[PDB]
Design a protein around this nucleic acid. Sequence first.
DNA 1: ATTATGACGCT
DNA 2: AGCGTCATA
Length: 430
Amino acid sequence: GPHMATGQDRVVALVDMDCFFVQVEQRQNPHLRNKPCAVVQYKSWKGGGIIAVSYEARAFGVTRSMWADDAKKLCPDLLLAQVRESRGKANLTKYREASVEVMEIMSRFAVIERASIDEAYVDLTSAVQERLQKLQGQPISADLLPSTYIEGLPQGPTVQKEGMRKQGLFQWLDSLQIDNLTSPDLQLTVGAVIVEEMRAAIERETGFQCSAGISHNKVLAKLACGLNKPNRQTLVSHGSVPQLFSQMPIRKIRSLGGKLGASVIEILGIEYMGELTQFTESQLQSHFGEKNGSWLYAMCRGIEHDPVKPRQLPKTIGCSKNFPGKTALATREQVQWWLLQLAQELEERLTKDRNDNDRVATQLVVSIRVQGDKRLSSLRRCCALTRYDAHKMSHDAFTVIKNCNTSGIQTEWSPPLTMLFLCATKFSAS
DNA sequence: ATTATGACGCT
DNA sequence: AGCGTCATA
Ligand SMILES: [Ca+2]
Ligand SMILES: [Mg+2]
Ligand SMILES: [Mg+2]
């Protein structure tokens, strides 16, 4: 009753760019705008691999991971933009730089946590309190929420999409009690107003559209964001959780999309997130461990406490390349040449990072994959990163992996290498 | 023969 | 430390 926490203490948003790499390319090349199009890397093997897809192209069934030649079978008029290649490898600089554009705008509104190249969590709790003070018991107009969906509404006693959206929003606003500044539902609504403003700022100042979720924690904000894409935002209230979770596959919740999620389904014999409520905390801890068990017990009730971390910059800077099938590296010279290529890109990015962000990396991590190994990484070794110099870094990387070479012949490398990875870690202020 | 990333947990 | 899991475009 009165002592039962409800996880309604914070307002958290998740902002995620729509078909991000595609929008970056469409901004640059107006011929690609409002067309079925995709971004691809490499070209020789089956037309290149697709890594991002416009919503127009998704209507034909085009997806990420598809070979472009195969995508063309579904969508013959598909337009393509290629990722830049430098030093023999895909170079993602343009997209990293576009990401910084967006993150810097978001940072004007609130503390953000960079969750990937195109998404960030926002802790709006303080901003909401401030806005509520300005408002002074003043009602919130639907006009302030022109692209917001309220999950679960409309309900109870129009056949068009926008019509339904407004009906739900009207029901929601009709109900609100703007008289109480501590009302969680009111707080979420003010959060959503701010996020409309944030999203408008992003589009005005970059040209990029995005979707967003607004809820009381990161997991629900992430889930909410995906409910209405593209170019829309969704508010998931605490009260919406039981119905939302009653038919929500477990795998849709962040962190449950893999083996742990599969085990929750198998061991408990359930399919939907809501079904978890019937287990005690101790039962869940017994199967999934102390940490996971407590997390699941709260999460299935819509409660999660993971904080929005104050971190706008990536914690590592890495460079990696696969060498699949027949392209695997089989000579020492090959291995050294490609380590150099990677190290040169890494040096370039590190030097820029040091100038922009007043920090220096202190550890170099070297990782490789050997032909036959099912695992993505076969081996990982670290050494000191004491100078931003590509020849030194490549020489040092070779030193830490050279003993992996089975070949009795110094000149030959066996088993051939199917991946190389250099990563700078452990930053210190500079 | 998806590839190129990046955060965090376990022991 | 080195390995594994889960996630991004
Ligand atoms: Ca996105
Ligand atoms: Mg994303
Ligand atoms: Mg995606």
